[PDB]
Design a protein around this motif. Structure first.
Motif, PDB file in Angstrom:
ATOM      1  N   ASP A   1      -4.895  -7.551   8.648  1.00 50.88           N
ATOM      2  CA  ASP A   1      -5.538  -6.954   7.584  1.00 50.88           C
ATOM      3  C   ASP A   1      -6.090  -7.874   6.734  1.00 50.88           C
ATOM      4  O   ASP A   1      -5.945  -8.136   5.673  1.00 50.88           O
TER       5      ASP A   1
ATOM      6  N   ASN B   1     -18.464  -8.082 -13.698  1.00 50.35           N
ATOM      7  CA  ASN B   1     -19.228  -8.688 -12.837  1.00 50.35           C
ATOM      8  C   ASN B   1     -20.100  -7.709 -12.191  1.00 50.35           C
ATOM      9  O   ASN B   1     -21.241  -7.883 -12.055  1.00 50.35           O
TER      10      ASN B   1
ATOM     11  N   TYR C   1       0.843  -1.104   0.058  1.00 51.78           N
ATOM     12  CA  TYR C   1      -0.049   0.018   0.047  1.00 51.78           C
ATOM     13  C   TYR C   1       0.770   1.239   0.076  1.00 51.78           C
ATOM     14  O   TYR C   1       1.936   1.194   0.548  1.00 51.78           O
TER      15      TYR C   1
ATOM     16  N   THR D   1     -17.122 -13.365  -4.195  1.00 53.07           N
ATOM     17  CA  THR D   1     -18.332 -12.561  -4.912  1.00 53.07           C
ATOM     18  C   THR D   1     -18.022 -11.386  -5.824  1.00 53.07           C
ATOM     19  O   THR D   1     -18.674 -11.075  -7.094  1.00 53.07           O
ATOM     20  N   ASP D   2     -16.621 -11.048  -5.750  1.00 55.75           N
ATOM     21  CA  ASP D   2     -16.034 -10.010  -6.798  1.00 55.75           C
ATOM     22  C   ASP D   2     -15.712 -10.566  -7.870  1.00 55.75           C
ATOM     23  O   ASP D   2     -15.721  -9.930  -9.011  1.00 55.75           O
ATOM     24  N   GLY D   3     -15.723 -11.859  -7.993  1.00 56.81           N
ATOM     25  CA  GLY D   3     -15.292 -12.615  -9.342  1.00 56.81           C
ATOM     26  C   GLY D   3     -13.994 -13.539  -9.289  1.00 56.81           C
ATOM     27  O   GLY D   3     -13.440 -14.091 -10.147  1.00 56.81           O
TER      28      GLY D   3
ATOM     29  N   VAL E   1      -9.073  -7.289   5.066  1.00 55.72           N
ATOM     30  CA  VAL E   1      -9.337  -6.890   3.751  1.00 55.72           C
ATOM     31  C   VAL E   1      -8.149  -6.746   2.875  1.00 55.72           C
ATOM     32  O   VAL E   1      -8.238  -6.689   1.457  1.00 55.72           O
TER      33      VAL E   1
ATOM     34  N   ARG F   1       2.448  -3.173 -16.353  1.00 50.81           N
ATOM     35  CA  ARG F   1       1.228  -4.198 -16.659  1.00 50.81           C
ATOM     36  C   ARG F   1       1.105  -4.678 -18.275  1.00 50.81           C
ATOM     37  O   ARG F   1       0.773  -5.965 -18.066  1.00 50.81           O
TER      38      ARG F   1
ATOM     39  N   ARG G   1      -7.875  -9.773  -5.437  1.00 48.36           N
ATOM     40  CA  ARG G   1      -8.020  -9.122  -6.499  1.00 48.36           C
ATOM     41  C   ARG G   1      -7.090  -8.828  -7.485  1.00 48.36           C
ATOM     42  O   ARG G   1      -7.195  -8.876  -8.628  1.00 48.36           O
ATOM     43  N   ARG G   2      -5.792  -8.284  -6.606  1.00 48.67           N
ATOM     44  CA  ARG G   2      -4.820  -8.067  -7.688  1.00 48.67           C
ATOM     45  C   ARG G   2      -3.997  -8.982  -8.393  1.00 48.67           C
ATOM     46  O   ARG G   2      -3.822  -8.957  -9.760  1.00 48.67           O
TER      47      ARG G   2
ATOM     48  N   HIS H   1       5.691  -8.412  -8.081  1.00 55.13           N
ATOM     49  CA  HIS H   1       5.715  -8.809  -9.334  1.00 55.13           C
ATOM     50  C   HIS H   1       7.056  -9.717  -9.833  1.00 55.13           C
ATOM     51  O   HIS H   1       6.863 -10.455 -10.531  1.00 55.13           O
TER      52      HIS H   1
ATOM     53  N   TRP I   1      -5.111  -6.585 -24.142  1.00 58.02           N
ATOM     54  CA  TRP I   1      -5.195  -8.001 -23.937  1.00 58.02           C
ATOM     55  C   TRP I   1      -6.566  -8.527 -24.831  1.00 58.02           C
ATOM     56  O   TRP I   1      -6.790  -9.580 -24.541  1.00 58.02           O
TER      57      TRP I   1
ATOM     58  N   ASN J   1      -6.960  -9.783 -11.245  1.00 54.50           N
ATOM     59  CA  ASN J   1      -6.851  -8.616 -12.060  1.00 54.50           C
ATOM     60  C   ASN J   1      -5.660  -8.623 -13.209  1.00 54.50           C
ATOM     61  O   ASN J   1      -5.801  -8.337 -14.252  1.00 54.50           O
ATOM     62  N   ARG J   2      -4.543  -9.067 -12.611  1.00 51.94           N
ATOM     63  CA  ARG J   2      -3.211  -8.950 -13.218  1.00 51.94           C
ATOM     64  C   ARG J   2      -3.040 -10.179 -14.115  1.00 51.94           C
ATOM     65  O   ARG J   2      -2.613 -10.242 -15.359  1.00 51.94           O
TER      66      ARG J   2
ATOM     67  N   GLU K   1      -9.513   0.024 -11.878  1.00 49.48           N
ATOM     68  CA  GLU K   1      -9.975  -0.933 -12.892  1.00 49.48           C
ATOM     69  C   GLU K   1     -11.344  -0.425 -13.584  1.00 49.48           C
ATOM     70  O   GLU K   1     -11.352  -0.583 -14.887  1.00 49.48           O
TER      71      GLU K   1
ATOM     72  N   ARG L   1      -8.493  -9.822   0.596  1.00 54.22           N
ATOM     73  CA  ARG L   1      -9.221  -9.588  -0.432  1.00 54.22           C
ATOM     74  C   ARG L   1      -8.553  -8.682  -1.717  1.00 54.22           C
ATOM     75  O   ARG L   1      -8.639  -9.060  -2.853  1.00 54.22           O
ATOM     76  N   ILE L   2      -7.894  -7.739  -1.190  1.00 53.43           N
ATOM     77  CA  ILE L   2      -7.218  -6.869  -1.913  1.00 53.43           C
ATOM     78  C   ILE L   2      -5.989  -7.646  -2.937  1.00 53.43           C
ATOM     79  O   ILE L   2      -5.808  -7.753  -4.234  1.00 53.43           O
TER      80      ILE L   2
ATOM     81  N   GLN M   1      -5.345 -13.189 -14.143  1.00 54.58           N
ATOM     82  CA  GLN M   1      -6.630 -14.046 -14.398  1.00 54.58           C
ATOM     83  C   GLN M   1      -6.301 -15.528 -13.932  1.00 54.58           C
ATOM     84  O   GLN M   1      -6.809 -16.357 -14.562  1.00 54.58           O
TER      85      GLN M   1
ATOM     86  N   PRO N   1      -7.455  -0.119   4.403  1.00 56.78           N
ATOM     87  CA  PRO N   1      -7.571  -0.902   3.469  1.00 56.78           C
ATOM     88  C   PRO N   1      -8.488  -0.218   2.572  1.00 56.78           C
ATOM     89  O   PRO N   1      -8.628  -0.717   1.525  1.00 56.78           O
TER      90      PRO N   1
END
Lengths: 475, 474
Positions: free
Chosen positions: A352, B265, A228, A411-413, A354, B365, A361-362, A249, B256, A365-366, B244, A357-358, A368, B233
């Motif tokens: 932490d 979603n 963060y 739930t976010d996918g 949350v 990215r 998600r990352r 990364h 991509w 998102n980066r 996003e 979750r972050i 798949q 957070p």
């Protein structure tokens, strides 16, 4: 918002590592690992604790699996000790070593528990260190591959889920940058070379896996602390860009894409630290796509700007005295800072959920990629009360909040395949003995003696039993 | 130690057709949606419109001579679709093509690389009338036919091409905010038109690989990198969502061929996701660009936004500071003032480090080279006696951004060039002429075209020296 349920086959798990649980360090033909030798150096480990016995899972695996079945575990993630299978790393197979893991796998399957086999948890055979410096030699690529293929041959029919290298960023950095783990080196040039060889070994074994276990799922597992920025000051956001790339990364891009990130590469090149590349390396790294990203998660890290003459190595908290760690960083790139918006453990780790979750998600998102959470837990000085009761509500609170955030990520996918709590039983820590306990199952031993090694279910055992029974609907 | 700008670096400047050309009804040119929209009473400041603008259509020889005096390595301009196909999809207009031929020849005769932008918001009105322009899949083949016409006429002389310029602006301003044609405020329609534009971009890149196999092409994205307000957070999560929804939503499709899943979603749960046809994903994924074009002005800071929270916000339309209000998606994120940067009277952040951050994010990215297609400072200029315009404020802004580009190059970002916005002063879409962006002052105002004479500002000579030294003297 309507939360999505955990998928019906979600792998509710718990985990361990061989050196931390097995014992039997010299039995049934097992050879020396680098940790057998390293932990016996005076002053290396707290009170001289070592893995000669640990919690004696090698002899007590039937009782431990019976407890897993009582809990209703859907999966158990363990590591295979390379020195049990090839006492010298290469050369002759030790059938008694394979037979132990065969017996363990059969015990799990007979109780409806999915084995998740971790190929490597930091315990390369000492003979490979003696011969060629282990991870510093390209010779380890084929030796590790032969070892992995031996396991694929014997167990691929019964093990669907495999993890390759577990927490490569830890064993490489602690072994070659901080000198805290074998081989105890402090040389960043050597660190990045060993890291590159480990990357090639990971890719080689994934490539082999496609031949021998075509229906299986395999991936590396990364020790992920999502970064963060401290705030919206541009220089702090830039520090975050540097930190996330350099710390995270740097490993996950190689695992997912077969490429190192360019800004980090250029920084290392400016310091004379970039690894040596051989013909065929990029082709191998790019061709070894994993089925999932394994994630070992405990905490996020907040960073801020760090000038060129700024902070380097900081003070780790290894005592459990809250407020005693200090900032670490890389001059010119970033330094860590306490996050004022989360609580911390007594070891100054952020609490932490949350952040999990972050991080999930990352990765989605980066890259798949589906994610297997291979490790998450709370370590604390649990006490054994009369009547063999361990009231660890603090552990339940931590696990509950993290599982809740996993459900939000689903739930976010995000495709989360499972969750392996660290750890099933209490275990030996690498350098700090036994007192900071992580298990659902208390083991009656301490740093001074093995006592009777008896297993005692903690309050959290029954909490997680109910989580599994309700597939996470009741947290 | 800073790395030098690469020897080949494309020091450029840019414009857009409606903003510069004039000649709105000459040589067979058809109406664009902007010709029509800007003539609605009250729509534009003091009724200003593109009938004349700065008359680059007739004055292009003088303008290119000024570019040659400056030593520009590249000039990025857009082609007006309605000059080439007055009705969008009918007969080609050779006089329209001939203007761009003459412009390209003038640039080449002065050693300036043309960078041709296919689309800058000016779809022919006839296509809006016929089928609603970007809301119909019919535009995909009509846009492709137009692009291929340009590739066929100019591909031998133009190496660098931009497809859609600031798609996120023309789509969001046209279909979410109602500020630009067609004047719609409807998120479902916005995402549908956006998906069609994505397919049109991909189709023309595929055509480009056939018709201009040695050229370089990419879309250009209006990029405001998002920042979290702090390390709470929930604020970092708001940043993940904002980056996003605002940025990856476009750039992941360009790079991509995939929309980001969490944003998809969410839109699906609201009934807002676009309609997908067979072949769409294959087309989007097969159209990789040579570079990402970046139009950069500012970063945006975000914080958590409760479900009861901010939705659409008010944008500053007057130049009175502090009149924009927060915008966001309830439950996901909302914008908040960044206390660590200054802002202009139009509420735009001044954040040159944010440009380095955005460049780093695109390299990190997507691993794509970047062409900075637009960056500049709009401000009032005073014309002093003797035709002198001293714009140190504009020099200061450009200098700081160019300095941060050099730091990004030193970090390892492949930056192909930098096109300052703008070469001459130009007409703004809704706000007239007084907020000027040019290196070259144009003598006109909101009331009168005066004589349209060109006057080199102090910044013209500063940038001339930047180019002469390849960025060593800033």
């Amino acid at each position: 918002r309507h939360l999505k349920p955990f998928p019906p086959e979600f792998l509710w798990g718990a985990a361990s590592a061989a050196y931390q649980v097995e014992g039997a360090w010299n039995e049934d033909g097992k050879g020396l690992s680098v940790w057998d030798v390293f932990a016996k150096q005076p002053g290396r480990t707290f009170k001289g604790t070592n893995g000669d016995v640990a919690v004696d899972h090698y002899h007590r695996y039937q009782e431990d699996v019976a407890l897993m079945a009582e809990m209703g575990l859907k999966a158990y993630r363990f590591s295979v000790s390379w020195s049990r299978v090839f006492p010298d790393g290469n050369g002759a197979v030790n059938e008694k070593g394979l037979d132990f893991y065969d017996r363990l796998i059969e015990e799990l399957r007979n109780h409806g528990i999915e084995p998740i086999v971790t190929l490597y948890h930091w315990d390369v055979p000492q003979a490979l260190m003696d011969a060629y410096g282990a991870w510093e030699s390209r010779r380890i690529i084929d030796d590790f591959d032969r070892y992995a293929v031996t396991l694929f041959q014997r167990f691929g029919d019964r093990v669907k889920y495999w993890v390759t290298l577990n927490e490569q960023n830890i064993f490489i950095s602690f072994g070659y940058r901080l000198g805290l783990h074998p081989p105890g080196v402090k040389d960043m040039k050597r660190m990045y070379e060993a890291n590159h060889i480990a990357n090639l070994a990971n890719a080689k074994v994934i490539q082999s896996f496609r031949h021998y276990v075509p229906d299986g799922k395999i991936g590396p597992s990364f020790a992920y602390s999502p970064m963060y920025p401290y705030d919206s000051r541009p220089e702090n956001v830039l520090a975050f860009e540097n930190a996330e790339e350099f710390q995270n990364h740097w490993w996950m891009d190689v695992y997912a894409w077969g490429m190192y990130p360019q800004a980090a590469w250029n920084y290392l090149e400016s310091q004379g630290l970039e690894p040596t590349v051989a013909p065929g390396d990029w082709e191998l790294l790019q061709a070894a796509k994993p089925d999932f990203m394994g994630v070992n998660y405990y905490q996020t890290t907040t960073v801020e700007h760090n000038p060129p003459d700024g902070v380097g190595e900081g003070v780790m908290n290894t005592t459990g005295k809250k407020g005693t760690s200090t900032s670490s960083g890389i001059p010119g790139l970033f330094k860590t800072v306490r996050n004022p918006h989360v609580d911390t453990t007594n070891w100054d780790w952020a609490i932490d959920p949350v952040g999990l979750r972050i991080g999930l998600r990352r990765i989605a998102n980066r890259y798949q990629l589906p994610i297997l959470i291979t490790e998450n837990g709370l370590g604390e000085f649990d006490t054994l009360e009369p009547g063999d009761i361990v009231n660890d509500d603090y552990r339940i609170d931590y696990l509950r909040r993290h599982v809740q955030e996993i459900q939000r990520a689903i739930t976010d996918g995000v495709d989360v395949l499972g969750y392996c709590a660290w750890s099933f039983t209490d275990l030996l820590s690498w350098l700090n003995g036994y007192q900071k306990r992580y298990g659902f199952v208390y083991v009656n031993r301490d740093d001074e003696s093995e006592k009777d090694l008896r297993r005692i279910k903690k309050k959290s055992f029954y909490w997680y039993q109910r989580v599994i029974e309700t597939n996470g609907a009741e947290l």
